[PDB]
């Protein structure tokens, strides 16, 4: 679950929080849908809605985010896309 | 309320089934196998 | 007929065992213990194939006619086949 | 070739040493072989799914009567055949533009004679190279390389 | 001007002609009561 | 019919329908519609759904 | 020494004159005239050429080589023309055998191959007159191929539409549908519409041209509308 | 290739258009991020912003969407998630 | 030359196409690398990426395949291994 | 069993493991398929699946690998192809 951030428009504190949150999510949850759901909900609570999370080993995306609320990073071989929009 | 509704969805793709297989060019009649009736002789 | 000859051969003090390997290492008849029967069939199947290749490699219009391998313990003979060959082991001593 | 075979007769056949499935044939008319296009080169594979031998696997539209069309040993599908005109052409079927030739000979004194045969030989150089010869009807022993079909060398 | 009269083709128009007629005649023979 | 569909210029005996409710339940009140525009195949098409 | 090459240039002239006319593409007819001009330029001294070989053939060799160089250029264009002619013929004869209601993808695939063939023609550095001859002629033959597809549908459109299923059941003494009946018939009708909406949106040979070349068939064969809609109504009548 | 719709909260017109748009995107592009970008941009133009698209063979997601603007379908073995939010 | 299938985890239709494709590749090319390249590329196009192909007279291999996308067969004395993975 | 690397798209540390793994495999195993299997398994354990390995004296290949996970080298006269895909 070593973290490597590829792209972010996010404060440093939220970047660290995202990695730690996703890291715990992967420790706790086995299925990507549930990993994504956990992560999404934690941000809605702390950082207001509306957050969206994609978790997986094989995907591409093209999305629109609110400024300063985007991160894309890997934990090992698993990519996590986390952003706010709406 | 402008945000009259906020519908949440979960999405999960299926898994991919893979197997380990042996092959070898030089060898016995059975090339590779996955990791006693003998009715096979009777026709001859 | 063939069974009587095999018995007569086995009775010879030189002969230490006979194996009839049919379907590429799968025997039907043996005068030996099971572990040896299976191992011997497999080894001689692979071994004879190697000899046949060697002959064809020497000349592309000739195949094996007979193959003999000798050791201190015992001696083994095999003959070429279309479908299956027969294994004989004897003590040369 | 179905339609063409109705009037033509076979005069030159060969097999591709490499593609043993590839059988070549060439029919023609006995007369008039000095003027017009007379025939085509019909090939058919005896390979997987070749259930209709009558359907050619390749057709080379040769501008004039050709005989003794053979394959170079090493090359997958490369041929050379002698035309009645006295010229030898070299096709390269690799391009699948089957009638399209690679190289053309000359029309000058080099080899005007209506050569009777074309044969390949290994070149003393790398084994991949095969010289192409013709049998002059006039008393010349003619050898050349592929690009050398123009401005012959021996 | 669907006729396309001031034009010439051999294989294209012959085969289209044949196919055109064969299909239409079969559909007429079906003798649908519609 | 409370649709968001772009209009089509041409018409060749087009079919569409809609659904309404009443309020005590949804009886599925279905209405069928036919349309044709211009002097095109008038009787050939008008005579079919009538 | 000269007849071997003299016959070649003579033949090319006499032959091209009666082979290029098989296609009527200016690409070949116009350049063949330029070749004829090279021949005529030499022919200006025909009276004297008649006596060269008898005394000294070298002068004639020069005249012939000039004509042969032109012949080589024209022969090359002839080969390209014959190649393309076959290419377009083969694809058109396939397209007319493609039923749009079953193998529509094969119809599109063949058109893509024709567009590639046309791109190959224009990529050779041709002018509007030459590329027009190619694309416009074949476009007319495509019209006939496509009109065939359209006419076939008008006779047996309903017979060759995608399958539709619906479940019937009874509830509280009423016939229920899953999906609703009005829904499945709307899909049925849209499939009929989709078919007729194809032979008027055409991007094949000459895709940059005027689509009217094809769309006229929709109104011209519009008498078939009675057939396909009468059958449609009879089917729904029988279903009712 | 063959389009198979698994989930949708979307009008029939947008469903078919989503498939058509994804079909063209898959024919034109090999990389998922570019396939998604094609599909997203076309939807913003035809059906107003803001759409988001995820394309891939292996992922889980948890997202929030507007009513009547969500579809999930396959083209062959490639899954496409398309929805409006914002 | 003569096609002999020893192992297969593949549909009957794809099995025959694999042999046919290799047979044509063997007819056209002498170099094993180029034969393999033909076979791989054709499979990616017809049956979706990502296929891998090894062609040779002397090798052993240990590989992982996706179910229904593996075959191992001979054409004469030349073995062809073809599968999907990724 | 002298090692000579012909081509690689791999970090230097992974290159060393490739040679060391194949070297041990060749010391321990006489049979080509078994050598290949040893090498493959060691990489799946350390660098995650899915790895594939070909070991032999006469073959050509055309394969697809994950970026930075490819090596092709000889040990003596025997070629080893080692890459990840899937």
Instruction: Provide the residue ranges of all domains of chain C, joining segments of one domain with +.
Output: 1-93
Give the closest of G180, G219, G233 to F48, CB-based. Answer: G233
- Give which of G5, G121, G17 is closest to G53, Cα–Cα: G5
With a CB-CB cutoff of 8 Å, which residues 1-60 of chain I face chain H?
48
- Give which of G239, I50, D67, G63 is closest to J65, Cα–Cα: I50
Q: What is the DSSP letter of D95?
A: G
Q: How far apart, in whole angstroms, are the C-alpha atoms of residue F5 and residue I84?
A: 44
Q: How far apart, in whole angstroms, are the C-alpha atoms of residue B25 and residue F38?
A: 75
Q: How far apart, in whole angstroms, are the C-alpha atoms of residue C27 and residue C29?
A: 6
Solved using? cryo-EM
Helix, strand, coil tally for chain H in percent (to 5): 40, 45, 20
The C-alpha of I60 sits at a distance from chain H's nearest C-alpha, in angstroms, of 31
Sheet holding D41-45, edge to edge: D9-15, D22-28, D41-45, D58-60
Give the closest of G8, G79, G83 to D107, CB-based. Answer: G8
- Which position has the token pair 């089509």? F8
Give the closest of D97, D100, D107 to G4, CB-based. Answer: D107
Cα angle F18-F24-F29, degrees, rounded to a multiple of 5: 20
Helix, strand, coil tally for chain J in percent (to 5): 40, 40, 20
Taking residue G89's Cβ as centre, other Cβ atoms within 10 Å add up to 17
Q: How far apart, in whole angstroms, are the C-alpha atoms of residue B41 and residue B44?
A: 6
Q: Does E13 touch chain G (CB under 8 A)?
A: yes
3-state SS, chain C, equals CHHHHHHHHHCCCCEEEEEEECCCCCEEEECCCHHHHHHHHHHHHHHHHHHHHHHHHHCCCCCCCCEEEECCCCEEEECCCCCCCEEEEECCC
Architecture of domain H1-86: 2-Layer Sandwich (3.30)
Q: What residues contact residue A67 under an 8 Å CB cut-off, 6+ apart? A: A9
H–A contact: 3+ Cβ pairs < 8 A:
yes
**Residue I50 CA to its chain's centroid (Å):** 13
The C-alpha of G179 sits at a distance from chain D's nearest C-alpha, in angstroms, of 47
H-helix segments, chain H: 12-28, 32-47
The C-alpha of G141 sits at a distance from chain E's nearest C-alpha, in angstroms, of 7
User: In chain D, which residues are followed by a C-to-N distance beyond 2.5 Å, i.e. a gap?
Assistant: none
- Do J29 and J21 touch, CB atoms closer than 8 A? no
- Could you give the 3-state DSSP secondary structure of residue H8? strand
Q: What residues contact residue D54 under an 8 Å CB cut-off, 6+ apart? A: D2, D44
- Do A17 and A25 touch, CB atoms closer than 8 A? no
The C-alpha of B13 sits at a distance from chain I's nearest C-alpha, in angstroms, of 15
With a CB-CB cutoff of 8 Å, which residues 8-47 of chain F face chain G?
12-17, 28, 30, 32, 40-41, 44-45
Chains with ≥3 CB–CB distances under 8 Å to J: B, I
Q: Does I20 touch chain D (CB under 8 A)?
A: yes
- Do C16 and C30 touch, CB atoms closer than 8 A? no
Chains with ≥3 CB–CB distances under 8 Å to C: B
Chains with ≥3 CB–CB distances under 8 Å to A: B, H
Q: How far apart, in whole angstroms, are the C-alpha atoms of residue D114 and residue D134?
A: 10
Peptide bond connecting G202 to the previous residue in cis, omega within 30 degrees of 0: no
The C-alpha of H62 sits at a distance from chain B's nearest C-alpha, in angstroms, of 5
If residue H10 lies in a helix (H) or strand (E), which one and from where to where? strand H3-10
CA-to-CA separations, G232 to F45, F50, G210, J54, in angstroms, rounded: 12, 14, 33, 62
Nearest-10 Cα torsion for D61, D63, D67, D68: -60
CB contact under 8 A, J33 and B22: yes
CB contact under 8 A, B7 and H64: yes
CB contact under 8 A, B41 and C24: no
Q: How far apart, in whole angstroms, are the C-alpha atoms of residue G138 and residue G121?
A: 13
Of I17, I28, I29, I73, which to mutate for an interface test with D (greatest number of D Cβ within 10 Å)? I28
Q: Does G215 touch chain F (CB under 8 A)?
A: no
CB contact under 8 A, B44 and C84: yes
Of G15, G16, G69, G79, which to mutate for an interface test with D (greatest number of D Cβ within 10 Å)? G79
Q: What residues contact residue D35 under an 8 Å CB cut-off, 6+ apart? A: none
- Give which of J38, J40, J37, J24 is closest to J75, Cα–Cα: J24
**Structure-token pair, residue I70:** 């593996």
- Do D99 and G80 touch, CB atoms closer than 8 A? no
Q: What is the DSSP letter of D55?
A: S
For A32, counting Cβ atoms within 10 Å of its Cβ (0-12 exposed, 13-18 middle, 19+ buried), the class is buried
Burial G157-192 (b: 16+ CB within 10 A, else e): bbeebeeeeeeeeeeeeeeeeeeebbbebbebbbbb
**Chain I residue at shortest CA distance from J57:** I58
Burial D63-77 (b: 16+ CB within 10 A, else e): bbbbbbbbbbeebbb
> Which chain I residues have a beta carbon less than 8 Å from that of H76?
48
Give the closest of E4, E15, E19 to G143, CB-based. Answer: E4
**Structure-token pair, residue E33:** 């009561």
If residue I61 lies in a helix (H) or strand (E), which one and from where to where? strand I51-66
| Start-to-end CA span in chain H (Å) | 31
If residue F44 lies in a helix (H) or strand (E), which one and from where to where? helix F42-46
Give the closest of H59, H64, H79 to B6, CB-based. Answer: H64
CB contact under 8 A, G196 and F14: no
F-G C-beta contacts closer than 8 Å: 34
Taking residue F42's Cβ as centre, other Cβ atoms within 10 Å add up to 10
- Could you give the 3-state DSSP secondary structure of residue D69? strand
> Which chain G residues have a beta carbon less than 8 Å from that of D100?
79
Taking residue J37's Cβ as centre, other Cβ atoms within 10 Å add up to 22
The C-alpha of E25 sits at a distance from chain G's nearest C-alpha, in angstroms, of 10
Backbone angles phi, psi at A51, to 5 degrees: -100, 155
CATH number of the domain at C1-93, please?
A: 3.30.450.30
| Start-to-end CA span in chain B (Å) | 85
F-H C-beta contacts closer than 8 Å: 3
If residue I36 lies in a helix (H) or strand (E), which one and from where to where? helix I32-47
Q: What residues contact residue I63 under an 8 Å CB cut-off, 6+ apart? A: B20, B21, B23, I52, I81, I83, I85, J40, J52, J53, J54
Q: How far apart, in whole angstroms, are the C-alpha atoms of residue I76 and residue I37?
A: 19
- Could you give the 3-state DSSP secondary structure of residue H60? strand
CA-to-CA separations, J16 to D140, I62, J67, in angstroms, rounded: 65, 20, 17
- Give which of C40, C35, C69 is closest to C54, Cα–Cα: C69
**Structure-token pair, residue I52:** 């891998």
Cα angle C9-C15-C21, degrees, rounded to a multiple of 5: 75
> Which chain J residues have a beta carbon less than 8 Å from that of B27?
33
Q: How far apart, in whole angstroms, are the C-alpha atoms of residue H51 and residue H82?
A: 7
Burial H46-76 (b: 16+ CB within 10 A, else e): ebeebbbbbbbbbbbbbbbbbeebbbbbbbe
């Amino acid at each position: 679950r070593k973290a490597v951030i590829k792209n972010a428009d996010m404060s440093e504190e939220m970047q660290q929080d995202s990695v730690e949150c996703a890291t715990q999510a992967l420790e706790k949850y086995n299925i990507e849908k549930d990993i994504a759901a956990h992560i999404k909900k934690e941000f809605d609570k702390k950082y207001n809605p509306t957050w969206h999370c994609i978790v997986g080993r094989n995907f591409g995306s093209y999305v629109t985010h609110e400024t300063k609320h985007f991160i894309y990073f890997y934990l090992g071989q698993v990519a996590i896309l986390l952003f706010k929009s709406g | 309320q402008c945000n009259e509704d906020n519908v949440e969805r979960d999405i999960q793709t299926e898994e991919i089934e893979t197997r380990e297989v042996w092959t070898q060019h030089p060898g016995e009649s059975t090339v590779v196998s996955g990791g006693t009736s003998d009715a096979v002789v009777m026709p001859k | 007929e063939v069974e009587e000859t095999l018995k007569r051969l086995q009775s010879q003090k030189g002969v230490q065992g006979i194996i009839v390997v049919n379907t590429e290492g799968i025997p039907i008849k043996s005068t030996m213990d099971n572990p040896t029967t299976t191992q011997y069939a497999s080894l001689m199947h692979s071994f004879i194939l190697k000899a046949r290749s060697t002959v064809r490699d020497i000349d592309p219009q000739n195949d094996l006619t007979f193959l003999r391998i000798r050791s201190k313990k015992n001696e083994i003979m095999v003959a070429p086949d279309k479908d299956y060959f027969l294994i004989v082991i004897q003590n040369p001593t | 070739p179905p339609a063409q075979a109705q009037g033509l007769h076979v005069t030159s056949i060969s097999w591709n040493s490499t593609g043993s499935v590839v059988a070549c044939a060439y029919g023609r008319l006995d007369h008039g072989d000095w003027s017009t296009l007379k025939s085509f080169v019909c090939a058919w594979n005896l390979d997987r799914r070749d259930l209709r031998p009558q359907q050619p696997s390749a057709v080379v539209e040769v501008p004039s009567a050709v005989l003794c069309l053979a394959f170079h040993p090493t090359q997958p599908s490369h041929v050379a055949g002698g035309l009645y005109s006295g010229e030898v052409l070299v096709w390269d079927l690799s391009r699948l533009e089957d009638p399209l030739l690679w190289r053309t000979g000359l029309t000058d004194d080099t080899h005007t004679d209506p050569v009777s045969q074309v044969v390949w030989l290994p070149e003393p150089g790398h084994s991949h190279r095969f010289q192409v010869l013709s049998v002059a009807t006039d008393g010349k022993v003619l050898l050349w390389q592929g690009i050398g079909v123009g401005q012959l060398q021996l | 001007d669907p006729a396309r009269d001031p034009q010439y083709a051999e294989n294209e128009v012959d085969e289209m002609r044949i196919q055109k007629d064969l299909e239409l005649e079969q559909y007429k023979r079906s003798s649908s009561k519609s | 019919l409370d649709r968001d569909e772009p209009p089509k210029p041409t018409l060749a005996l087009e079919y569409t329908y809609g659904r309404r409710a009443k309020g005590h339940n949804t009886p599925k009140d279905i209405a069928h519609f036919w349309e044709l525009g211009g002097g095109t195949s008038l009787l050939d098409l008008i005579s079919i759904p009538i | 020494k000269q007849a071997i090459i003299l016959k070649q240039v003579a033949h090319f002239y006499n032959s091209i004159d009666q082979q290029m006319i098989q296609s009527q593409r200016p690409m070949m007819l116009q350049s063949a005239l330029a070749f004829e001009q090279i021949i005529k330029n030499s022919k200006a001294g025909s009276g004297g050429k008649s006596q060269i070989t008898w005394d000294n053939p070298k002068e004639l060799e020069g005249y012939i080589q000039k004509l042969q160089n032109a012949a080589e250029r024209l022969a090359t264009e002839n080969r390209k023309l014959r190649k393309w002619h076959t290419t377009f013929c083969e694809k058109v004869v396939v397209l007319m055998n493609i039923d749009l209601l079953r193998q529509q993808q094969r119809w599109k695939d063949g058109l893509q191959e024709l567009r590639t063939g046309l791109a190959t023609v224009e990529a050779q550095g041709f002018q509007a007159s030459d590329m027009h001859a190619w694309k416009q002629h074949w476009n007319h033959q495509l019209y006939k191929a496509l009109e065939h597809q359209y006419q076939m549908g008008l006779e047996a459109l309903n017979e060759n539409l995608p399958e539709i299923n619906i479940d019937l059941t009874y509830k509280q003494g009423r016939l229920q549908f899953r999906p609703p009946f009005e829904e499945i018939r709307a899909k049925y009708y849209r499939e009929m519409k989709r078919f007729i909406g194809i032979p008027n949106q055409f991007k094949g040979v000459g895709e940059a041209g005027d689509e009217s070349i094809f769309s006229i068939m929709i109104d011209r064969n519009a008498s078939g509308f009675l057939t396909i809609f009468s059958k449609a109504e009879d089917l729904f009548r029988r279903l009712s």
